Amino acid sequence: KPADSTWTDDQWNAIVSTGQDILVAAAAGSGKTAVLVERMIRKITAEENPIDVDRLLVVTFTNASAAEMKHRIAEALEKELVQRPGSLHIRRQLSLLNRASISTLHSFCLQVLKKYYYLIDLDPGFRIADQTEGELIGDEVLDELFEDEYAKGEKAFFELVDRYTTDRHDLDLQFLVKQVYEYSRSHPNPEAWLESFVHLYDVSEKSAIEELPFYQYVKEDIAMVLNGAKEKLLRALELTKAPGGPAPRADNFLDDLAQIDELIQHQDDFSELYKRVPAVSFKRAKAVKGDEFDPALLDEATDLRNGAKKLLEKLKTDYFTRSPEQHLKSLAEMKPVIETLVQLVISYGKRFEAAKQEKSIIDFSDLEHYCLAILTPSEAARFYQEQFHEVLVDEYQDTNLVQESILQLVTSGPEETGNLFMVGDVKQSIYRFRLAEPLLFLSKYKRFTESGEGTGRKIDLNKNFRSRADILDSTNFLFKQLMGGKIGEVDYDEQAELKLGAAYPDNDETETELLLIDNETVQFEAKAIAKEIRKLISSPFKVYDGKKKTHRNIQYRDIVILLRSMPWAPQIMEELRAQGIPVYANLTSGYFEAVEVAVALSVLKVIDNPYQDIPLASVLRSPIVGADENELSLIRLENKKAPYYEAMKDYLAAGDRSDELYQKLNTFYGHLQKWRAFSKNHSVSELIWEVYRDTKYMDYVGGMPGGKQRQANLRVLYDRARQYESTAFRGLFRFLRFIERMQERGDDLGTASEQEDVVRLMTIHSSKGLEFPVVFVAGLGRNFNMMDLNKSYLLDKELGFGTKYIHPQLRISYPTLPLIAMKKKMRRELLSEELRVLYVALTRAKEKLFLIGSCKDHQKQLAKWQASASQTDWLLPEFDRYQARTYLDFIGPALARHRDLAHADISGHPARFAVQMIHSYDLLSERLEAIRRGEPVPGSFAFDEKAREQLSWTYPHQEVTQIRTKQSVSEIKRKLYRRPAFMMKKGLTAAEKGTAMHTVMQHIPLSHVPSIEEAEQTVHRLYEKELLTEEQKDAIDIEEIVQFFHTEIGGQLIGAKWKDREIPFSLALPAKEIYPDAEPLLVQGIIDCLYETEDGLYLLAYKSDRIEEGAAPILKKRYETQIQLYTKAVEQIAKTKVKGCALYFFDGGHILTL
């Protein structure tokens, strides 16, 4: 249904369209979130036939997006509720939203695991392990597997080891195993993908090179460089037509070109190229003598021709130094080694899963794979299909194959009539190293149509509502000449270009700036950045608030520096902090190089094992103790051969208390011993906190340069210890081992101020989804990371595993053809990703842009840029874009044709640029001493009285904060490690028999004196009522039961007005009556018997004490306080009075009165 309400037609399509799988290509700045929300709201808040929220499935990249989704949906539900308050449905959706399925894919998979744990071999109470924890488990099973393989000693294994290890150790092999396994985990069937490795090496001499898969990349590479050698020579030929250009040398060029064209004719024939390419030679350059020429152009043409020479020689050394038959033979010889490798990796996988199951543990990879195992479509899958009416997926361009196989599985119906709704943008796919596939998005882009006729719908959102025209124009201009072909993987045309949709009052300083620095380079860089920032702050720059239409002077909050990498961040932070610019940046590593963390860890180490000289010396020299070098050496002087700890003990054993160094070491020693005993009974976290308060080290570092950070570094160590308590539970032993093992393999943790007026320095990758008025992108004059394409082996999504030809005995190695193919492929893929990184970089802004890079010589590099910018067509030469290794190599030539820095439309594009050729030379107390002395500062402060009142204050009722409320009679009077039941003899103990008689006494009829028969009858009934255990019933004396009722007190018990037994009481006693100094505490108990006669109220209690005159005075005091507590209870609560108490003893039938 069509309607109008501030949406665009495309956005409208993305909201209302239903019936098939829909792909929404949301550009940067497009209201993808708002559209997604509105689309959901309509389904949730419809009038005709609404659906519940829990019938949907929203998959996000980060939890931030899911939470934001939840809140915006909530706000919309609130608005709807304002318009229709009465509706039960709309109200109910707000309650359901907390239980809604708005999660990440990992979280959803977790839900599936928790629900269908029984389908696969999984524990219902499984725990998702730490990355370090799992990797330590992996390391262990690797060592065990390797040890087992060495033990078997198979030839194939040694053959593998000898090839993929150094001459001294076998680490590199185990790293290879880990890598292959991880890379295999990114396929919905890891084992099959691993077993497809051998198909690449299953060749012979009779095999056609041009028919094999990997050759697809070998082909284009040749077609590229040859076409790169032709053009490079055509430009030389054109340079012969120039007036100052050399005319005779064109003959040589006309020869060389003819040779290259000859090669281009046979590009599809690899066998022919082997015969032709190595035979190509460039004739001696015909020297041009005369002053009618031009030395610059003369020497330039030679450079171009030598460029063709370089390219050709590179092509020959890449492919044509051995025959295609020899290539095939080499590739065929490597097959068994590949088979061994695969089986080894598979073994590691099975061992790793078994190990993880042993501890009820899964990975993040297991989170996807176990979920997928569950869904396979199985009953679970059909249930989830039934439940979800639609599945929404955000950032679809970063979805991997396993995630996709889960999405396609949980969605109901084929692609033509599916419910899978997905939104994203390939141009912003910057996560390929995490093995995500943007081709998954692009394939569905081409597969779909703009209509929904018998296929999936594609919808393109072009309008950018959040950024200025200058930004969009600059971006479109640059990436029109950069993205496309094999370097962009996507054609940069209309319907892909950014379109203006933001209403902006024009400013004159919004033009994109480029700052090129001549000649740390980062020093000059950051200084130039600082100057521009300072100029932007000093002279009022107005930032426009699009929502409220008001200009505000720019804050430090609105300025962000974006970097490709973070090693440059510290220096930039230091320089900007020096310039007076507030800077914040988050670090994902460098936590264990912080001095405070090193010292605190050293303390934990000494507490674990004091006989470690280095952590000890660390603690001693640290502010914790404060020993200086003279004092430390003094400690060593006492004992030179023994450990440093022994030397410390010896100094303590020989030193006098009048020494300051003695006080240091002694106080530390007492502290140390306390910690030793403390660590054994408490957790690690508790030990850390106790250390922190006993040393005040956290308080100390809080008062030194950068203490804000330092205290946080010490805080997260406590929090990390608490985190570890789940992994393998508590203990300094376990904790320190875990940290040590984490560092020894090279793993790290973050150093983990979001308030205004701070300049954020962060990675371009992290800036994804964020937006700022002013964006600085530096390091543009710095090389990309091509370290991936150097090793003897390589891993690919399609081709699988490539590797050099390695012969251990002959000590020879040389690259195999599929390896080189993979290198070319991975390079241009990497370059594509980098180009997309530059894209999100430039699109993260709203007002102004700042491009900054460095170089060696300005003019020569400008000519280098002009060399690439000679073509009339929009798109820059694909080979020149391929040869790029620096971000400048992308920006420069694209900017060379522009009017500011080459006819036709390219000059007239509405993009504006400002270029600055910067050079390196152009960038070039009373209170204090009072505190140092320990003396107070002089002055009258308003809070002096308050502070001194509060520091002296003591809680009025402190003496009763520790006093137990509930007490017991035995405990008041007061104011054995038993053996197992199956180790002792058969029952019958003192307490058993005593209680067994007590039960009879409290259950025996008090109507009249019973005989032996009546007593035995009562006992028998208590035996049948299960009031008495059979062992309690078997062992009983019958005499004392008779003896009591023959007594005086017994006779008075039988004859009484009123009787009661086992009367539970709670008594409130003033605190003073039990405690010496300075509010009722409770005292509970059970009075055995009470009876009332015409004389008064009498108390009775039974005791099974050992007796058989002299025992009576002892028994009197043994239960004195007890009886007094009983009498106090009756007299205070019942408000009556007790006249006389009586205690009966079974052992003999004695009675004493109190």
């Binding site: 001294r168 094992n609 050496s633 002087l637 440093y644």
Partner: protein, 801 residues
Amino acid sequence: KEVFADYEIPYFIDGKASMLNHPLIEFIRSSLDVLKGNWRYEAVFRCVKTELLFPLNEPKAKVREQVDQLENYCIAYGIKGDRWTKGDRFQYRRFVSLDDDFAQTDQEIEMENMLNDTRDWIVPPLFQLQKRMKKAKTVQEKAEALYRYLEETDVPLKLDQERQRAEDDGRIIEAQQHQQAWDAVIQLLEEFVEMMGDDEISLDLFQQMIEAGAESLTFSLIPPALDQVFVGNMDLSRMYGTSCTFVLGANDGVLPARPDENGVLSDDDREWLKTIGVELSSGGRERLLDEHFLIYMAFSSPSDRLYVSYPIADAEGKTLLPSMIVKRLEELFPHHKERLLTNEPEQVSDEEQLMYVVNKSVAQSFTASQLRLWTREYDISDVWWSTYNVLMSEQDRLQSKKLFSSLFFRNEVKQLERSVSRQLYGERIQGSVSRMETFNACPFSHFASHGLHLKERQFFKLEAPDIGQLFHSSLKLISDRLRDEKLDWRDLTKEQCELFSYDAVERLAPKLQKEILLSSNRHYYVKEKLQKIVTRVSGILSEHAKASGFVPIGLELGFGGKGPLPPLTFQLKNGCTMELVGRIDRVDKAESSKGLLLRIVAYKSSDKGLDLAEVYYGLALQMLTYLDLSITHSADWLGMRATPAGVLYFHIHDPMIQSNLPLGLDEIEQEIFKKFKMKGLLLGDQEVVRLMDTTLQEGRSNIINAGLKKDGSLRSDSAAVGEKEFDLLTKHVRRTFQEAGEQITDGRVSIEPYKMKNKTPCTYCAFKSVCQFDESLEENEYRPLKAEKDKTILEWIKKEA
């Protein structure tokens, strides 16, 4: 717990503590881990450090100090498994070199005895436990074996002593939990044998169930007192007469809390079962809707004041969102101020900053931060100045003064007093080139090395220096056997090289790093790798011998100490004599027209050659020192005054050539041979070059880094220099040693690391936690060394002359 303890607030937590930290439970669990994992290092010392294995009525502080040194020993020697249960004594020797063999010092015997005593009281109870456990089949006898293990070690008595100590210190609640722990364990065993006493069970499943039961163990709830702050939940916790109620964690997902459905029955299951007629527990949507009633009961409980708080960030730094309740309260009470809770007082009013100072500890904590903030040009509130004055007005002020000493803290290093340095280093510094280089790189690193003699924890792991020693001693052995059988390196065949090298490594293996190469199959293969390396090196040395005019004089020739050559001696201002002993790797002599020629060759594991910049800064002084001594003593030791032929590095390795051309076996052999082309420095003349490579007629050399033209003169690519440069370099080395030794005796121990070519010595140093170097902290900076070209260096050495 920790915050209220620190803020002196008495509390009552309606929750039962876990026993998983109690020494008794850990003792049991880690014991079963010893039995299951076959006596792993971790399980064994987890078992020991619970102190329940400690000898009865022995000083805990002494027993611990014994266990520790046993631990360090177990770590360095990789003791595990049956080695614990073997009859063999743990043999100890503080220092062993594979070039000789001594006898045990009385000290080492004393130490070894102590170690074996410690082992002898640790093993038996743990051993006997493994005996019965293997033999026990049913559950009852396994639990019986476990309990016997508890009683034999006198655990009840040790727990009783511990709780008595706890009572004595006043920790009565801590004292009670011991008896609680024992009762818990005994009850667990009883229930176990009650349900499956006669059932035969495996050790793994027994441990699994013991572990499972131990995880459930809870200490009895600490009884409520007369005056406590009641901290509890919002589901089962009950209250009465509450005046003030604090509501915590008003975050989304937390309040209302999303109910985890999981069990045997799902929400759809229970829902359908509800429609059938079966009424079970509530569902997810039901318990989610009950949340409002719970929030209602919590909000309506306080009589006087209600506080609703929420954190915006988690422990790591992840953003936490406010609840729907916060917004609801913002609706019901639209003009109610939101109060900010922060540990950064400068973000709240002075009246709120005044609430911080509640006692001495927290006041000191905050005011130290406030003082640092004050040093950063901030007008901090006067309340902290008031509290500061109070903290310096009462008795305990030195503690506060010490805390506030951080305000002016820098990583300063006090120079060692003359008396202290003289006593520490000694009257005579008997050192080496390595020590002098260590000082030159960083003075403080030298102070911690050859001063404090701090030793890093020794591990049962094969490192690079150990392997280097293996190579050195191997070549030494081969050389000796060569002179024994009247053989020369020229006369060595492939078979002979292989057998010689293999046997040499075989001889050195059982004395290399606590016999690590014999400890596993993996290290066995490492041994074979090393044998292959020594083999190929032997072959290269053979080929080199057949193409060189230089004959090796003394291999591993030591100067000073017991060596044939006398030590180089230095005199200092302090009066302390400084002599350097060392071991020259190899010295070669050769006759020529210039007279006698001497060159020094050192076996390196790296290929990189001598850097004149590194020599200038005294970082590479080995070779030139060796050459200086060899030349200066060439008369009294050998024959006549000789001439420096040069210094050479030999790369010991087994290379893999990466050729892009189909090579033949001979071409491959040549490409391998070319990888051993020695780097270093040479004498700038044709005769010497021809003496080091007699094969070289014209072109480049495959043995030495030099070449020849048609004339006979060496090309500019040759790493050679005149005799002037050599003598100049040696004099520079001597001056470096003199100055270094001078600064050492003066007591200079400052932290001064260098940074040349983006390289720092700090990366290879283990004293990083001792020096506590902080670049951000001023007065602490690297020493930028300009990596100049050789000619610039030599020009500097000339201008210094």
